[PDB]
């Protein structure tokens, strides 16, 4: 996914 870095940043918010 070309937007995987943005998805990673959102994943980091899932605490």
């Amino acid at each position: 996914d070309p937007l995987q870095p943005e998805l990673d940043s959102f994943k980091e918010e899932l605490d």
Partner: nanobody
Amino acid sequence: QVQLVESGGGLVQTGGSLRLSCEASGSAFSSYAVNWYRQAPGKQREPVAAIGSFNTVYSDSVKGRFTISRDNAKNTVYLQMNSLKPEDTAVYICNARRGATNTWGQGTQVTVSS
């Protein structure tokens, strides 16, 4: 450089479904990931779901019940919400993310009652 507007909220029976839309106006929408958050009065805002061009991420709170999807031809991202519970009641708001820059919508109300 996009503006976002949410729609599709309402008042629905417990166990029912809604489909929210996050519509974007502006250029290069395909270069933004789209994230849904929700926030009830008195509480903190929490992440719900995210989509890139096609890959998706879900909070554990909605896994198996919600599905996020994207149609760039319509500059729209959808959040299909199934098996809704009273605890899903909140304002749902979308967020377009391009690198470290974030744009936010306004919010649409979702109320779930039995």
